[PDB]
Amino acid sequence: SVISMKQLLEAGVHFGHQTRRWNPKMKPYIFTERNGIHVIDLQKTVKLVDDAYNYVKNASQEGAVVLFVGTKKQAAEAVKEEALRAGQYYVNHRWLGGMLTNWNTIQTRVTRLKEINKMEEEGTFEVLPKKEVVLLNKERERLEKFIGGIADMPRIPDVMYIVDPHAEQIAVKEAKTLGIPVVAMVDTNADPEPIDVVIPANDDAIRAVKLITAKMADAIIEGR
Amino acid sequence: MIKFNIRGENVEVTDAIRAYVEDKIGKLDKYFNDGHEVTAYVNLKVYTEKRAKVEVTLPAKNVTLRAEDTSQDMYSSIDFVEEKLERQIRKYKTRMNRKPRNDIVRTKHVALKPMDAEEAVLQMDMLGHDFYVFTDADSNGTHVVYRRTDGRYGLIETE
Amino acid sequence: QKVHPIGMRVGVIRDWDAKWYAEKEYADYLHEDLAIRQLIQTKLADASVSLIETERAINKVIVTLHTAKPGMVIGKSGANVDALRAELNKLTGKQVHINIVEIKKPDLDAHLVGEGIAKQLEARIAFRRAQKQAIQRAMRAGAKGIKTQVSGRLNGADIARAEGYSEGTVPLHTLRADIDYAWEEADTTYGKLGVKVWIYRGEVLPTKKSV
Amino acid sequence: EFEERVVSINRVTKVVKGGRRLRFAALVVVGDRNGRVGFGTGKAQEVPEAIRKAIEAAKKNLITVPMVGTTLPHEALGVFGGGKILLKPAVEGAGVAAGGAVRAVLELAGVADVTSKSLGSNTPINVVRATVDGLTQLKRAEEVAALRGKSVSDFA
RNA sequence: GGUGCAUGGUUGUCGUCAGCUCGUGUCGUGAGAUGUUGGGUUAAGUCCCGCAACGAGCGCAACCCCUAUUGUUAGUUGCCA
RNA sequence: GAAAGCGGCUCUCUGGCCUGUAACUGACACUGAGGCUCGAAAGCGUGGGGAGCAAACAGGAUUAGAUACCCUGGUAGUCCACGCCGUAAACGAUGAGUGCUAGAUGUAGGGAGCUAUAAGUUCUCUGUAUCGCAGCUAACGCAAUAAGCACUCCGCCUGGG
Numbered sequence: 001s002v003i004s005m006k007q008l009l010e011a012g013v014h015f016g017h018q019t020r021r022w023n024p025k026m027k028p029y030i031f032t033e034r035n036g037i038h039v040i041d042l043q044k045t046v047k048l049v050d051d052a053y054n055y056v057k058n059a060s061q062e063g064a065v066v067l068f069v070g071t072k073k074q075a076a077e078a079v080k081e082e083a084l085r086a087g088q089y090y091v092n093h094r095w096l097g098g099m100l101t102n103w104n105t106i107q108t109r110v111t112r113l114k115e116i117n118k119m120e121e122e123g124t125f126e127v128l129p130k131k132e133v134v135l136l137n138k139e140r141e142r143l144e145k146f147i148g149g150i151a152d153m154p155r156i157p158d159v160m161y162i163v164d165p166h167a168e169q170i171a172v173k174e175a176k177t178l179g180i181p182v183v184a185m186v187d188t189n190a191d192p193e194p195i196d197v198v199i200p201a202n203d204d205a206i207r208a209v210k211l212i213t214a215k216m217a218d219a220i221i222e223g224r
Numbered sequence: 225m226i227k228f229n230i231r232g233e234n235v236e237v238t239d240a241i242r243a244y245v246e247d248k249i250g251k252l253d254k255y256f257n258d259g260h261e262v263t264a265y266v267n268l269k270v271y272t273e274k275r276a277k278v279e280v281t282l283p284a285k286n287v288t289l290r291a292e293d294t295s296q297d298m299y300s301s302i303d304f305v306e307e308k309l310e311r312q313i314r315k316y317k318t319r320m321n322r323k324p325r326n327d328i329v330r331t332k333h334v335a336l337k338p339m340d341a342e343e344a345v346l347q348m349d350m351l352g353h354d355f356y357v358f359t360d361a362d363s364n365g366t367h368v369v370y371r372r373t374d375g376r377y378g379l380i381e382t383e
Numbered sequence: 384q385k386v387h388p389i390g391m392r393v394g395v396i397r398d399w400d401a402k403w404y405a406e407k408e409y410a411d412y413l414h415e416d417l418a419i420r421q422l423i424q425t426k427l428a429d430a431s432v433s434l435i436e437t438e439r440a441i442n443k444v445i446v447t448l449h450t451a452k453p454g455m456v457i458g459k460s461g462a463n464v465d466a467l468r469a470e471l472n473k474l475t476g477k478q479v480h481i482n483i484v485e486i487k488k489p490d491l492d493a494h495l496v497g498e499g500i501a502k503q504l505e506a507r508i509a510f511r512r513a514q515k516q517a518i519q520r521a522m523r524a525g526a527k528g529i530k531t532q533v534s535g536r537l538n539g540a541d542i543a544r545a546e547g548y549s550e551g552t553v554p555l556h557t558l559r560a561d562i563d564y565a566w567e568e569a570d571t572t573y574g575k576l577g578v579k580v581w582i583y584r585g586e587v588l589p590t591k592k593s594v
Numbered sequence: 595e596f597e598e599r600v601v602s603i604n605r606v607t608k609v610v611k612g613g614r615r616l617r618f619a620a621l622v623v624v625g626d627r628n629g630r631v632g633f634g635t636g637k638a639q640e641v642p643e644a645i646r647k648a649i650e651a652a653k654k655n656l657i658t659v660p661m662v663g664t665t666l667p668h669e670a671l672g673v674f675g676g677g678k679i680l681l682k683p684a685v686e687g688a689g690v691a692a693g694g695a696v697r698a699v700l701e702l703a704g705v706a707d708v709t710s711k712s713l714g715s716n717t718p719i720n721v722v723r724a725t726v727d728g729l730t731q732l733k734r735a736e737e738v739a740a741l742r743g744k745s746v747s748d749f750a
Numbered sequence: 751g752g753u754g755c756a757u758g759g760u761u762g763u764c765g766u767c768a769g770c771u772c773g774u775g776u777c778g779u780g781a782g783a784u785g786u787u788g789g790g791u792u793a794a795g796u797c798c799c800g801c802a803a804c805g806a807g808c809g810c811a812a813c814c815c816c817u818a819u820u821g822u823u824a825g826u827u828g829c830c831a
Numbered sequence: 832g833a834a835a836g837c838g839g840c841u842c843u844c845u846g847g848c849c850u851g852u853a854a855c856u857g858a859c860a861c862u863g864a865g866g867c868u869c870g871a872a873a874g875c876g877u878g879g880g881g882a883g884c885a886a887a888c889a890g891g892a893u894u895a896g897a898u899a900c901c902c903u904g905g906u907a908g909u910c911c912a913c914g915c916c917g918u919a920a921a922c923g924a925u926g927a928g929u930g931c932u933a934g935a936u937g938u939a940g941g942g943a944g945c946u947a948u949a950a951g952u953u954c955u956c957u958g959u960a961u962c963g964c965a966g967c968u969a970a971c972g973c974a975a976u977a978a979g980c981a982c983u984c985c986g987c988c989u990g991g992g
Contacts, residue, residue: 010362104774173777395814540757552806554807554809576758589813617781
């Protein structure tokens with residue numbers, strides 16, 4: 001149950017950030033520095049990622065909602081495709097504060113995302129003159145801005161995966177509100193002792209989010 | 225000065241403490257230049273002085289400022305409110321006198337972390353440039369992938 | 384200052400309570416019929432006033448009436464507004480006309496809700512839970528924008544207290560106000576109580592255009 | 595739903611531009627007399643609105659003290675600013691010996707007796723926090739048998 | 751008549767302001783922050799970008815008349831091309 | 832440099848650290864009431880030196896008024912040897928000693944490597960910042976030169992006038 005650092009080399013997973021503002025707790029993983037980025041060897045991060053290879057299966061097989069967040073720049077379409085194969089929805093948008101504990105925010109996000117969108121999909125769009133087009137700026141713009149995708153989901157997920165909690169301080173506190181566990185790809189720029197997993201990965205290379213997010217939601221497939 | 229309008233508007237008028245009004249506005253005529261118009265407008269009521277309203281308005285030749293203020297005693301309202309007119313002119317010193325109060329951007333690569341030269345195929349696809357501004361992680365230094373016009377993976381490379 | 388919604392509707396933006404025309408004695412029959420409407424609202428003293436529109440006609444009068452319910456107001460079986468209607472015939476001396484029509488669901492009427500809860504203010508109800516109670520009844524029964532208003536005057540008090548649960552989208556500045564609104568003074572030894580009920584079930588109200 | 599106690603309606607204000615907005619606040623404590631105590635706060639305009647907010651905040655931060663038979667584990671302390679509440683187990687079942695804002699606490703936690711004055715201040719919004727802390731300092735005998743590493747026969 | 755810092759209701763004003771608010775929520779011992787901070791634009795808290803936020807109002811703005819372009823009516827006592 | 836403070840230049844005799852070092856004493860340690868010394872800033876004593884500056888005061892605006900800010904000046908005084916006061920926001924309104932420890936960080940001058948065909952890096956010590964782990968307080972904030980966790984010498988403090 002391993003797709004290891006023997007193939008995680010060039011796609012850009014096991015690398016740090018620009019070698020500044022790193023964190024002193026996380027030094028037994030990230031060692032070297034040259035040409036702008038830290039480079040991570042195969043010593044601990046292989047079985048460290050194999051831990052997630054065990055537990056994403058274990059959380060997946062009990063039949064609960066999963067959640068991925070790919071807000072970061074080269075990481076939206078991975079959470080798209082692995083939300084498709086995972087089955088539960090994607091978060092690919094800049095993160096909105098106040099998500100979980102406020103009901104009618106995401107509930108009205110459901111009702112205007114799809115239910116007032118039924119007015120678009122039925123005989124209300126073609127019966128109103130040009131003043132409905134700005135109503136479709138609220139619809140045709142504020143639906144995919146305030147997208148969510150949460151209308152499939154009737155109850156809080158099992159896992160809150162995230163490309164970067166250091167860029168995503170917000171839902172990390174929302175997930176540690178009522179007790180939902182998290183998964184992330186946490187690099188040198190964060191101290192992941194609150195995070196359940198240590199995945200030393202960055203975004204803007206070619207296939208880091210593709211590999212790690214791929215076999216994570218594959219573990220969700222065999223969990224489902 | 226020029227003109228008054230003395231007005232006791234609930235009780236009759238008595239020119240001892242009204243003369244005391246006339247003398248503290250005599251000290252307005254120590255702080256005058258043209259005492260253009262004033263007006264006393266006072267009000268005292270029943271129930272053993274649960275108020276003491278007084279007023280004098282101040283249309284001077286440039287500024288206007290009234291005073292409908294209170295104390296328990298009407299004598300104390302003449303006292304503290306005309307002393308309030310003194311301290312108002314003390315506020316009106318500087319408010320009166322002191323009309324003077326006295327191409328390509330010359331910059332480095334905007335990205336932070338280094339990306340290898342194979343990632344430049346994705347880094348050109350990252351932000352939407354035909355080149356890929358990325359400090360090379362695989363190659364020692366800087367590398368970038370262009371777009372050759374034939375349609376293959378180009379390389380803007382000193383190499 | 385506050386604009387009266389019905390004060391800018393019921394004249395011409397909503398059609399008239401004196402919904403009839405004349406040639407010369409328009410304000411004569413209009414004003415004296417308004418005195419007759421006062422006689423209706425004061426001689427329903429063992430009944431419930433809802434709405435009345437007394438009319439002058441081609442037969443020189445057709446009295447339009449309304450009730451809050453027919454089963455109790457109009458009589459033992461319908462002879463209080465009929466015997467009192469002939470009493471209006473011996474008031475003003477004319478052909479005199481009954482119109483037994485319940486104003487439907489008077490828990491959505493500003494008259495019976497606010498005036499009824501003001502009669503219960505005469506019965507000394509806790510007025511805050513009266514506000515939440517009554518506006519929760521009608522907001523429960525629709526009322527897209529609904530609020531009310533109560534004045535103060537408790538045994539030598541100030542002008543007016545606050546007004547809890549005075550809510551509801553009532554865009555009174557805008558020109559879409561379809562509001563059953565009322566107001567009331569309760570005269571007591573302890574003082575008077577103003578009760579002003581905005582009820583907004585319908586959305587639109589110009590009643591002024593016709594081909 | 596919990597067993598209810600109401601501490602006090604507070605007195606706070608909002609100072610608007612052209613006057614003085616009447617702000618309203620409250621603080622309750624809840625729980626089901628077993629060791630579980632919560633507390634709520636009403637930042638509103640009226641009393642049942644502060645009951646609404648009082649259960650909005652009373653529904654959370656409601657945890658369990660390891661109640662060793664209607665008693666305390668041992669003598670603890672609570673410090674949060676001027677809330678300085680030292681709680682003492684003593685002879686139990688013979689008189690609920692507590693301050694006013696903490697007699698409700700061992701009511702809603704179910705301690706038989708305590709011996710709890712306070713120092714610092716009698717400010718209730720620090721009394722409740724020092725009370726949470728006074729429950730928080732407690733290790734228990736199953737941990738001194740367990741977390742200490744040896745099943746010590748002071749409790750066994 | 752007296753008693754409008756005792757009365758209700760009406761009532762003039764700031765201000766025809768563009769600001770005022772509130773609910774959910776989070777954060778802060780607490781009042782307090784959230785909307786309201788935001789990028790220009792407007793007359794607009796206009797929308798809009800980041801945003802602990804989201805929504806709801808109260809809104810100038812939106813709906814009402816009057817005049818400012820043309821058809822359906824055409825002689826009444828008014829129009830005669 | 833304990834601070835007070837110390838900056839044209841050159842000599843005179845002059846402390847005090849740190850880096851290394853066990854060569855050596857073998858606990859000689861830390862303090863510190865008392866007592867003693869030093870010590871801002873003025874001023875005071877005697878005697879000089881007297882550019883420029885400036886208390887005191889004068890003249891001119893200033894306004895109701897100007898004994899003030901501005902200007903014109905201008906005495907004491909500022910400087911030099913030579914004695915004194917012992918009081919300064921003395922401050923960082925943060926006693927002295929030593930121990931502990933996330934890091935991002937300044938800069939000195941050593942010790943060591945260091946990078947070699949000249950380059951330029953890493954550790955170590957006392958320094959002095961800035962952010963911030965923990966801890967932390969009423970909050971503000973402090974945080975390796977702790978407002979964190981300990982102990983020894985002292986000192987203060989008891990509601991306001």
